[PDB]
Structures are given as C-alpha cells and as structure tokens.
Design a protein around this ligand. Sequence first.
Ligand SMILES: Nc1ncnc2c1ncn2[C@@H]1O[C@H](COP(=O)(O)OP(=O)(O)O)[C@@H](O)[C@H]1O
Ligand SMILES: Nc1ncnc2c1ncn2[C@@H]1O[C@H](COP(=O)(O)OP(=O)(O)O)[C@@H](O)[C@H]1O
Ligand SMILES: NCCC[C@H](N)C(=O)O
Ligand SMILES: NCCC[C@H](N)C(=O)O
Ligand SMILES: [Cl-]
Ligand SMILES: [K+]
Ligand SMILES: [K+]
Ligand SMILES: [K+]
Ligand SMILES: [K+]
Ligand SMILES: [Mn+2]
Ligand SMILES: [Mn+2]
Lengths: 342, 342
Amino acid sequence: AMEIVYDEADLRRYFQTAVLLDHFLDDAVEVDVDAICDGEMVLIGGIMEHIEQAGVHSGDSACSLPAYTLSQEIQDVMRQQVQKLAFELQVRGLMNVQFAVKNNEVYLIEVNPRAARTVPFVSKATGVPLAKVAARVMAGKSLAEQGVTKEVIPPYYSVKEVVLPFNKFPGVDPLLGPEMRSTGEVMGVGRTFAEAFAKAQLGSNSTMKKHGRALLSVREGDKERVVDLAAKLLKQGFELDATHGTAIVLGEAGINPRLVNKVHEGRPHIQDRIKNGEYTYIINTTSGRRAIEDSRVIRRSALQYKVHYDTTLNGGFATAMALNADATEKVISVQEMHAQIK
Amino acid sequence: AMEIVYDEADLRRYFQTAVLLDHFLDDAVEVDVDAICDGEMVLIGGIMEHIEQAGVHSGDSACSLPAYTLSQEIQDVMRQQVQKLAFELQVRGLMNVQFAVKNNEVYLIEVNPRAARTVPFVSKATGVPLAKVAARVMAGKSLAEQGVTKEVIPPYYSVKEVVLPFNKFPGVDPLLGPEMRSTGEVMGVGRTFAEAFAKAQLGSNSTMKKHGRALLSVREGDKERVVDLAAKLLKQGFELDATHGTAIVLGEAGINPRLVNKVHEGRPHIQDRIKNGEYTYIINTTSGRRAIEDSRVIRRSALQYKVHYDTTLNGGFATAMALNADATEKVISVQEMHAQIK
Ligand SMILES: Nc1ncnc2c1ncn2[C@@H]1O[C@H](COP(=O)(O)OP(=O)(O)O)[C@@H](O)[C@H]1O
Ligand SMILES: Nc1ncnc2c1ncn2[C@@H]1O[C@H](COP(=O)(O)OP(=O)(O)O)[C@@H](O)[C@H]1O
Ligand SMILES: NCCC[C@H](N)C(=O)O
Ligand SMILES: NCCC[C@H](N)C(=O)O
Ligand SMILES: [Cl-]
Ligand SMILES: [K+]
Ligand SMILES: [K+]
Ligand SMILES: [K+]
Ligand SMILES: [K+]
Ligand SMILES: [Mn+2]
Ligand SMILES: [Mn+2]
C-alpha cells in the first residue's frame, strides 16, 4: 500500500482505515536514472524524466529520454549523486536511482541496486545493451575492458508510455497514484518530444482525437495552469466544457467554456454528457481522498465510453503537444535509429 | 396585505407570520381597460397592455397604449366582456377593468366602477378627456349627446413608466409585486413601441446604458425565455455574466456567458462586481419567499450602485427593444399628437 495525507484530519482519517512517514514532494518532477558501476567507474545508462509528477508511480508514468524540461545543470547534479551513491553502496552491475526535483533542488526517492524495469527501454533508446554490459561487469569484465564507458544521448526522443488494466475491473476508480497498476508499456520515437509522445500515446491505444469538445475539471492547485491548457485546446479547434470552479477560473482569464453540471448540481451533468458522446477529451485532476471518491464518476464514465482522459495537468500538456504531431507521418527502424547514434 | 404562496409548506409558513384564496395566474399578461358607460352604450376609453406580468401590481407596471403584443382577437373579448359588465353593473360615467390573459384565455381580475389612476394617461394618449366626458355623462348628458361614441386608436405608441421611492428607503428590497409602491409616473410617445418605451424609460430616470456588461440571473420559469434576451443583449454589444443555473441554460443554447459566483459561493461574487461598477445592466428574476430573501442583496446592491435593473423578463425584453431606439431623436408636442388622430 501507499497513501497521501493532506491534513491533520486526513491523518487520523487514514489512521482509522489504516509506519514510515515522509513529506510528499508536491509539484515535483520525477526522474529515473539507470546506471552501471564496475567498482572503477559509473556509467549513466539513461536519465528519464517522467511526464507525471512525483506521486504517480514511475511504473505508471510516461517518460522521456532525454529529459524534455530538465536543465542540464540539474541533470548534472543527478548524475553526480548517482555516482556518489554507486561507489558508496558498492554496486557491481545495474542500479537505478529515483529523484524528485522540486524548486531546483534534487531530492532522493530511492535506490534500486539491481536491474530496473526501465532497463529495456533505455537499451532500446540508446543502442546500449545494458543488461549485457552489466552482466559482463558482474561476471568480471570492467566497463573500460568492454569499451562502454560513455553515456549515450540519442539524437532523437524516446518516449515511454504505459497501459493500465482498469478496463478489466470497471469497479475500480481509474486514477493514477503512488501505487503501480500498469501491465505494460510501449515506446514512441520522434524527432521531437511532441512526435515521440504522440507515437507513444497512440501505441498505448489512446482514443485521443484532434477535434471535438474537451471537458476541463481541475483541482484548485491546477486552476492556474489550466488556463494555458485551455488556450492550447482552443487554438487546436476544440470546444470546451467545464465545471463550476474551473469555469470561474477560465472566465476570469478571458475563457468562457460551456458550463457543465456536476452530478449533484443537476442536468444535464458530465456523466450524461459523457454517456452521450459529447466529449472527445477529458482533463480531470483531483486532490484528496474525499474529492477523489466524489469525482470518481468522471473517470469511470470516461473509461466506459472510451474517451481519452488525462488525470494530471502534466499529462494534459503532453497530450496537447502531441496534437501538433502526426504519429503516422514517419516511421523509423531500430537499426536506423541505432545507426544515427554518433 | 397580499402575498403569493406556492406550496403546502409555503402556505402554513405564511399563516405563521400571518381571508381570500385565489388561483395564481402564472406567466400571464395583465391588461387595463378604462371606459365610459351611460346605460345606453359603452365607450372604450383605452386598452393598456402591462409590460410586467400579472403578479406585479398595475400601479407599478409599465404599460402600453395600444397593446404591443396582444392580439386583436383577444382585445375584442375583453372589449366584449367590459361592456357586459358596464351594463350589468349599471355603470354610469367611468369604469375600469383588469384582465389577465393566460393561454389565450381572458380571466377577470377586478372591476372598478369609478375613475382609475390610468385615466389621465389614456386621456393624454388618445386626446379624449375621459374625465369630463364621464362627468357630462354623470350629469345627464349621454355619450351620444356629447358626440363621443367611438373608441379612438392612436397612430403612435404611448408608454407609461413608473418611478419608485426605494431610494428613499434603503432597508427595503427594491422589488416589485402585488402591492403598489410607486409614487409617480412618466410618459413616452413614439412611432414604435421601442421608441415609446425608450422615452418612458429615460423619463423615469433610468441609468440604463447602451453598452458594457450585463448580469443575468433568472428564475427557473424564466430560464427558457432568457436565451432570447441574452441573444438580444449580445447583438447590442454587451458582455455577459451569469450565475450558475442561468449560465447552464445559456450554454445549452450556444451562449457562454462569463460565470459568476453568488455571494455564498466565492470571490469575487456578484456583490463585489456590482459594487465595482462592473455592470451597466442587471436582469434578475426570482420566485419564492426564500429565493427572494436570498437574492435581496442583488437588488439592493444594484439600486445602491445605480445600475439599471429589471426584475421581470418582460421588463428586460422591453429594455432590450428600447436599445434599438433613441429617445432623443424626435420630439413631438401634445398638440401635434392630437392632431394626428382620426
Ligand atoms: N517523498 C515523496 N514525494 C513525492 N512522491 C513520492 C515520495 N515518495 C514516493 N513518492 C512516489 O511514490 C512512488 C513509489 O515510491 P517508491 O519509494 O519508489 O516505492 P516502490 O518501491 O514501489 O518503487 C514514486 O515512484 C513516487 O511517485
Ligand atoms: N388571480 C390573480 N392572478 C395573478 N395576478 C393577480 C391576481 N389577482 C391580482 N393579481 C395581481 O395583483 C394586483 C392586485 O390585484 P387587485 O385585486 O387588482 O388589487 P388592488 O385592490 O390593489 O387594485 C393586480 O394588479 C395583479 O398584478
Ligand atoms: N502514463 C499514465 C496513463 C495516463 C492516463 N491517461 C491518465 O492520465 O490517468
Ligand atoms: N415598471 C417598474 C419599474 C421597473 C424596475 N426596473 C424593475 O424591473 O423592478
Ligand atoms: Cl470490477
Ligand atoms: K511520476
Ligand atoms: K523499489
Ligand atoms: K402587471
Ligand atoms: K381595487
Ligand atoms: Mn520506486
Ligand atoms: Mn387593481
């Protein structure tokens, strides 16, 4: 298990239902780092920046190699910490290090001193067979002896997206969190981030469309960045609907979405609107046990009626960017990809 | 003392703070008819169609001479009805009748076998000193004898608007009802109902503007018709704001107003905006002792801030028609007016 308590009252509440305690790094970028240590040196296999923020398990987060928003400066910091950790822990073969970047500061989430699930994706994206290398290291052949001593940074973007099994258990609230529920993943290769993400989104079987009406229903903390996402959808040709508070926020910024009723507010409401095929896209972010349990019907209908939905603002942005790409425009083979690697 | 009750609950509730019970003719057109009978015949002095529906006391209703929406067919029955009354009642001199028109049916409200407060208006509009005629009649000189026998229909529209003393008494909810509160009245003469109403409106000291932002917040029964008014305002160049329910309705119709918060909903709310002179027009309609008490702050606020406001949808429609006209375009003397009559 894993849960995120927001306030004192939430604490006891949880406790009632319910021990390590940890400050939840809100509004942080999650990063994964795969590396090999031979006792002599440390090789960075790959720095992957997650699309979904810290708080959504990495196994359920889409990610990019290379990072699409992290500064080189901060990545360099993560690279140095990985090395510090590698040598100190006595790693010999693979390791994976997870961070959270909040306010230009690097925080450590955890160290997995072994092969991590991102190893295949990184190998594919970079042309380096990490498990083959780390296995030789473990058996006794150094990285220097193998001629694998420099971190590779591909000339293209590699985006990994996941597939979740919620459709198999419709009674479950289809939302992301600190616990992993995904079964698999796909990879998208693009000239740009938008291009890789688009191919990854499509590969994951997304029903995302390039037109239609979008439903925006976000949490307080997102209300501010929503405006921009709303502008983006607008410039794309989407029409918009929104719930009360979200509408309030848009209006104030000059955006007037068409108001939609909350299930308790009356009719018609979102469920009806979703059930009746009015939307081609949904962005609904929530925060707090109670608020979640309450918004459960949005997510559930969206999944039922096959409407593409994002449950993170970060995901919404990414989806928005891909709107600008065409995943069927161009294709590349793995051999070509690896040949482009200088 | 007169009040309107809506349900069982409502009735006792009254009874508490609290006898004739009368069906309430909801969504009906109120009409006033002034006439003279001499036992021999009946002369129709004037048929005035109120702008505010039945439920808004005659003395506080703006009215039109001649009717501005009413059918000839309907007028004729009223006309017939009056007569019948004039005789049965044995009326000799002046009389006034008030009808209500629901679903093309004419209901009888009250008959006043004397001179009504409308007489001077009618007299000025039509050119006939109803007062003297009736006087001559009362003193033995028949309509026939006098040479006044056929109902006069003017060639221009005459609109009567009233003035309320609410500003002298602020603790008062400046809202209309079955009880008269006005002190005086003004007259507007025009080629079109719109032009007459525009003059009457200006004449009544209205602060209505020809631009800015409107605030719409109407009751359920009105929610339907409001769309058309919204559209009209829209055509005139106004920007719109609406409270939730109203914003929904509008949206369902293609109109996305800017969503605003009621007072208990958040900040800023309507009071805040009114207070900041955010609006140039407000349309607020309400049903229920509760909805009314609850909306009180809207009206007091508007009154206090000098924003023109309508408390009836019919009123709003008229305000809107008037936006088409220009009260200062043409001036006409009473002498001239009377000269045009055939
Ligand atoms: N302090 C924290 N702040 C923010 N997010 C965190 C924090 N600790 C854990 N998480 C989130 O929870 C997920 C799982 O935590 P982790 O320690 O890596 O568990 P696991 O062993 O299942 O991999 C992370 O991938 C991350 O999104
Ligand atoms: N049955 C009714 N249905 C709807 N409105 C009514 C009804 N009876 C009266 N009214 C409204 O209340 C007002 C007052 O009624 P009325 O009997 O004419 O009172 P008053 O003696 O003050 O002139 C009317 O001018 C009208 O707007
Ligand atoms: N990478 C996780 C899958 C994203 C899913 N559309 C969601 O936003 O919940
Ligand atoms: N004819 C009565 C005055 C109208 C006022 N604006 C109101 O609608 O309450
Ligand atoms: Cl299930
Ligand atoms: K994450
Ligand atoms: K772990
Ligand atoms: K009336
Ligand atoms: K009376
Ligand atoms: Mn982990
Ligand atoms: Mn009356």
